[PDB]
Design a protein around this ligand. Structure first.
Ligand SMILES: *Cc1c(COP(=O)(O)O)cnc(C)c1O
Ligand SMILES: *Cc1c(COP(=O)(O)O)cnc(C)c1O
Lengths: 367, 370
């Protein structure tokens, strides 16, 4: 009861009231609340199409499937990301081409993308990491020059702006509504795209391949089941209404960590030089034993003993058994250095000033 | 619309809302203790060893077949007379569905039809427990055993179904659905029961990113790529309430179904036949066959006229092999009992919040439209 986790959702009477309305309606799976959430994300991003899905992982699965990616194709991706993207690429039969990230913001650079392009490349998947945007214009420019789509992993970037627009204003991006995300419906995701044909395929492939060949709907080609229930969509709508205030509070907390950890050896990520608004999904520090007098793993342990949770976002995929053995030649020095040294300290909007003080005090004590 | 009688509606009330409140207050909203409790509850319900909650029965099928190693070059025997999810999952693993016909009066596959379709390439048999009645699973299983072929049961319709005095899935492997129209619901969700330890271990990893502990105790990592089909605790809590309600809900469904059986006996509409083997019917759907020669009206027109009278109906199911992808990929498939029924069935309103007057309304309209 005194434990301070690294994240907790902000669920209250508004969420319970939205659930009451869905239960009372009798329409609990995909329905009007899905449609409302999708319209809301078009209004948020300014992009044309929004497709709600059961998870961002499922969203990535069907987006890559709808693009036709399969055996013989390469997909450029960081290793420094969640394993879902790599797994989906593999489970479509395609080959992930893992590239290194910037050592201080953990995001892929246009130069590293261009160097990895081959005649087999069929997609590039940058990650907007921790709530900051990647330099998406420059990455998009590389893709355009070679005719390669860019699919943005925007799980961390609900409320992120880049050069004055919300992430995903154009192109294709995938958001997550998992429990630790800045807006949550326990599990859920949503794809935005400006590509009409892609949006039509995705919508079918997330609901059994059903489509019209006006004849009744039937399986046009096999698809998966990744639709989002209206129970969950209703929660997501409440949490999107809260997102601006939630991100404001996250930014206040993150600002205080940046300031009060500046005279500690723990090293936050660097803020990108391009114009942006950070959503502050995670507050990551690097723990370099030679600088801090403590290792990353030991810091996490001792914080836990003090009642303070931490997360590891992420253990680089290429270091994990399946990828380590399948892709033994992959050597990504910035990724490997950071992967061994990062952790996420508590950041969520229901944190009080005293919770933040407890974290800062503990880090000063352990340095 | 306020007077519309749909063919199904969930029974959501204060108990469900109080379960949701508890989960939200706890702050643990995705997979957690409610999942574990739901799984334990399904082991106690069925008597089987392992229970794995998933985000849908479709995802359950996907990961179950995947964990069995089903892939290119393997044949999977399945009815066409079922939901398209099973056929789609077979295909999307690269395997080949072998569609067989069903009994003309209960719409379930027979042991004879299974045996006739077995080849050296067959790697699974997927019977469907249809509308709330069980298939003759001992006989189907015996065919599987004789040839060394696993039987994976589609039990989406069979929460509360008994066979020979035990709940469906008491042994073997079976997959339940908690979709909105199923007898217990958490809007979307499912659950796998299995008696196979290794299969259960593989499934648990493949529905959550392939994560596992490597042999030779380290932290979790990707052992082999997996999917994301875990069930949130918000949903698991709803399912727990609906399972607590399932005995009473199924009793009410049986009362309605018995009344339909009796009061449609003097109409030309033809319910499914009740299997001869011993069972307890869950009464997920009340299906009628509408043959224009006998009834004076076609299935499609009956559904349209009922809708005009404020009465909803469903079509469970348009046989998979008649749908574009399968008709064009598998044009050679010819399944006379399936094709005859698929063109003639519909599901009339059956859900436990129906009142006696709702049931009278349906019976009266069917009598009018004969
Ligand atoms: C968790 C995560 C995903 C997958 O999201 P789900 O909603 O859990 O499927 C994808 N990308 C990143 C960066 C993530 O953190
Ligand atoms: C409900 C249904 C399914 C799939 O169920 P979901 O939980 O919606 O994925 C599979 N088989 C049958 C026979 C069904 O009725």
């Amino acid at each position: 009861s005194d434990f301070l986790p690294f994240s907790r959702p902000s669920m209250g009477d508004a969420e319970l009231a939205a659930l009451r309305e869905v239960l009372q309606s009798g329409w609990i799976t995909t329905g009007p609340k899905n449609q409302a959430l999708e319209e809301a994300f078009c209004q948020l991003t300014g992009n044309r199409h929004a497709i709600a899905v059961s998870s961002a992982t499922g969203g990535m699965h069907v987006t890559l499937m709808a693009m036709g990616i399969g055996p013989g194709d390469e997909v450029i991706t960081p290793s420094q990301t969640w394993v879902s993207t790599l797994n989906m690429i593999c489970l479509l039969g395609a080959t992930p081409v893992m590239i290194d990230v910037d050592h201080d913001n953990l995001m892929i650079t246009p130069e590293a993308v261009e160097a990895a392009i081959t005649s087999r490349t069929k997609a590039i998947i940058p990650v907007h990491y921790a709530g900051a945007p990647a330099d998406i214009d420059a990455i998009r420019a590389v893709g355009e020059r070679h005719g390669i789509p860019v699919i943005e992993d925007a799980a961390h970037a609900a409320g992120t702006h880049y050069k004055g627009r919300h992430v995903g204003w154009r192109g294709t991006a995938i958001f997550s509504f998992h429990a630790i995300k800045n807006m949550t419906c326990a599990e859920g995701g949503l794809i935005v795209t400006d590509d009409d044909e892609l949006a039509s395929r995705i919508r079918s492939l997330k609901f059994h391949g059903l489509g019209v060949d006006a004849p009744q709907a039937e399986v046009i080609t096999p698809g998966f089941k990744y639709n989002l229930a209206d129970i969950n969509a209703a929660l997501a709508l409440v949490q999107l209404d809260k997102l601006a205030q939630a991100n404001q509070r996250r930014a206040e907390i993150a600002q205080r960590y940046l300031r009060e950890l500046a005279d500690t050896p723990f090293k936050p990520l660097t803020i990108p030089a391009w114009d942006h608004q950070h959503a502050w999904h995670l507050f990551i520090i690097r723990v370099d034993e030679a600088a801090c007098g403590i290792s990353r793993d030991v810091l996490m342990e001792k914080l836990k003993a003090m009642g303070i949770g931490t997360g590891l976002h992420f253990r680089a995929a290429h270091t994990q058994k399946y990828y380590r053995e399948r892709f033994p030649e992959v050597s990504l020095p910035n990724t490997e250095w950071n992967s061994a040294r990062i952790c996420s300290i508590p950041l969520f909007p229901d944190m009080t000033d005293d919770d933040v003080t407890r974290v800062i005090t503990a880090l000063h004590q352990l340095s």
